[PDB]
Structures are given as structure tokens and as C-alpha cells.
Write an enzyme that holds these catalytic residues in place. Sequence first.
Site, mmCIF file in Angstrom:
data_model
loop_
_atom_site.group_PDB
_atom_site.id
_atom_site.type_symbol
_atom_site.label_atom_id
_atom_site.label_comp_id
_atom_site.label_asym_id
_atom_site.label_seq_id
_atom_site.Cartn_x
_atom_site.Cartn_y
_atom_site.Cartn_z
ATOM 1 N N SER A 29 22.486 25.266 -25.884
ATOM 2 C CA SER A 29 23.203 24.719 -27.217
ATOM 3 C C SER A 29 23.987 23.810 -27.377
ATOM 4 C CB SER A 29 24.651 25.769 -27.947
ATOM 5 O OG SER A 29 25.844 25.727 -26.528
ATOM 6 N N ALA A 31 25.177 19.560 -29.527
ATOM 7 C CA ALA A 31 25.940 19.305 -30.904
ATOM 8 C C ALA A 31 25.116 19.633 -32.416
ATOM 9 C CB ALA A 31 26.090 17.612 -30.445
ATOM 10 N N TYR A 32 24.353 19.914 -32.060
ATOM 11 C CA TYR A 32 23.393 19.571 -33.360
ATOM 12 C C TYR A 32 22.900 21.604 -33.857
ATOM 13 C CZ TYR A 32 22.256 14.401 -34.010
ATOM 14 O OH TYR A 32 23.115 13.367 -34.380
ATOM 15 N N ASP A 165 11.074 19.092 -29.645
ATOM 16 C CA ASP A 165 11.508 18.324 -29.427
ATOM 17 C C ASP A 165 13.422 19.325 -29.543
ATOM 18 O OD1 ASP A 165 14.153 16.877 -28.707
ATOM 19 O OD2 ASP A 165 12.992 15.107 -29.990
#
EC number: 2.7.11.24
Length: 351
Positions: A29, A31-32, A165
Site C-alpha cells: 500500500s 498514499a494512492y 507503474d
Amino acid sequence: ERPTFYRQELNKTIWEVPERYQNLSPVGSGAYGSVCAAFDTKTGLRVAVKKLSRPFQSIIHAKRTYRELRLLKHMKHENVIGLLDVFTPARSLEEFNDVYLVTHLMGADLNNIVKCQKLTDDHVQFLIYQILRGLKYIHSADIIHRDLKPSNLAVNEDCELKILDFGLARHTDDEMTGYVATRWYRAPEIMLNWMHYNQTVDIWSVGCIMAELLTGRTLFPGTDHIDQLKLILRLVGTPGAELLKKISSESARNYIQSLTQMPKMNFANVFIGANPLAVDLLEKMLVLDSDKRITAAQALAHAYFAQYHDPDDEPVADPYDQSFESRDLLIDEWKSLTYDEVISFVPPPLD
Ligand SMILES: CC(C)(C)c1c/c(=N\C(=O)Nc2ccc(Cl)cc2)n(-c2ccccc2)[nH]1
């Protein structure tokens, strides 16, 4: 027609996914978003599922969510991430707040591979050939990766490679600071904000990656931005007047001119015992002036990849409309755009 969804809590986040996906286990995991591994009972593939974190909390986030879904829907190449599935538990636009993105679980990233197994020259040829093959495709759509690095390269047990990405981190100043892998593959024009950057920023990254596959060691493991620049300029030489003119950041230009001038090194004396053709390609990839770097399509024709190069099987991308990038919209407009893209998704065929 709408599948049934079931809920579960994994590492204090709710996952609501179609029944077809089973045995969800967390893998990462930031922030996004958050990623889980799973078994897709429909296709019989092991999959990775990214749940985006609050995808429409700001304009920046909503546009990013649209951007990602648009990019991922477009990508149809063996050496690039493909969208197996995109879904939301929402039954209408009004309740649309969550986006889940599904792709193949490959098994390892390229950090795993360099750490845990020794690579012959044939392995370096095959892995770098595939990166460049995927990059040719990416760049033909006028898409710049900008964060090519080993952790964004997924590799299966037959050394077949895909560019992706994960996009979980913000890439803030702090995340780019210190003795960190998040900065070691970045072209110096991006790292120090010298100028408007080209797609060959990604070729620099390939150079750094290739060097590392050959030596087993990071090429430019700088302890900070300036130390990393110094390591770079020790190898490739300090810039001449021609490149200095192109550095539109007057502040950055002023600093580089403070350094004592250094010549380019002999790369055969750095990469001792490497295939001379690998050394030749490296010199063409690790050029300070990004106008003068080799492109992906050029590099694919290099003699180093003679055993893999097939100009009939190195395809380009269908035209990609990025006109959205220069557009200012509201959150709910980005949301509805994103919702249309989810709804229109057609999954790939299972061969
Ligand atoms: C390789 C390419 C440049 C096409 C790209 C891919 C990408 N996204 C992903 O790789 N998504 C992804 C990765 C892993 C998983 Cl499990 C699910 C989705 N981008 C991305 C990521 C975050 C924001 C915007 C774009 N950009």
C-alpha cells in the site's frame, strides 16, 4: 449482468470485489492505493488488484484516476501491464466512489531477480530487449513513464517482463531524499529539474537498470541529489557549453558550472569483462544531453539484441488521445468521465 460482490477487511481497508476473485491477501500500500493478490476463478489466472484510495477526493486525484484508467485501457502489449478487469461496487454514477484495477500477478520484480539470481549476458540481452520493446510501444503513444526502476518491472519464471507503474507513492521531496532507490534511476534533468524533459528520460533509466543487471550493483547509488549528480558526472563527464545552454533553470545551470570539469570515463574500465556490445549500448544510453540519447526503436536495432530483434514483431501503439491532460474540469466531471471508462471496459480474450 452485474456480478455479485462480497466484502472483507484487509489491513484496515474495505475490499468489495466480484465473487470471481478469491483468496485476497495484501501485498502493499501507499498514499494512492492498496494492492492484493488473488485467484481469478473465471480466467484461472493469479491476479493483482489495486484498490485506489479515495480516487475523487481532489481534482488532482480525480484527474489521476482518469489518467490511470485511460492509460491502462490503452495498453495492449506483451511487455506492458494489461488491464484484465476494472470494476466498482457502485450501481450508478451517484454512488460511484471506488475504483479497482486488475492485472496479472507475475511472481517477481526485477529487484528480486538482481538480488537473488546471477544473470548471464543472454539474460541481460533478453530482459533489456523486452524493456525496450515495451518502451518503444509506450513512447509511440507519446507516453513518458518517468519512474522506470526495477520495482516497476515485473518478471515471471521464464524471464518474460512487463513494464508497469504501481503508482502507490506520491514522490514527494522527502521520498526522493537520501540514500533511496526512488531517485537512483532518474535522469539528471528530471532529478534536478533542468528543463522540460523528453521521453529519453526513460532511456537513462534503462541504462541504469542494464548496468545493474551486468554488475549486480546500482550504478548511481547517491546518498542525496548532489552526491548522485557527482557520481553521474564522474562517469559521463561534466556538461559542455551546448548542454549548459539547454538548461533553462538558471539556478541549476549556475550550480553545475561551479563543478570542476571532468572527462567521460572509459566504460570498458567500469564494466570490466562485459560484452563490448553491452558497453557500447550503455555509452549511447547514458548520454548527459537527452537530445543525443539513443531512442527505444534505435536501441532495438543495436547489435547487442541481434538474437532477439525482429522488426516485424516490435509493434507500436494505436493513437492515444491525451487532450484531457491540458483540460481543467471539476471533480464530478472527472468522476463521470472515469465512470464512462469503467462502464465501457471490454475484457481481453483468454488465449
Ligand atoms: C506503464 C504506464 C506508464 C503505462 C503506467 C502504468 C500505470 N499504472 C499501473 O501500472 N497500474 C497498476 C499496477 C499494478 C496493479 Cl496490481 C494494478 C494497476 N501508470 C500510472 C500509475 C499511476 C497513475 C497514473 C498512471 N502508468
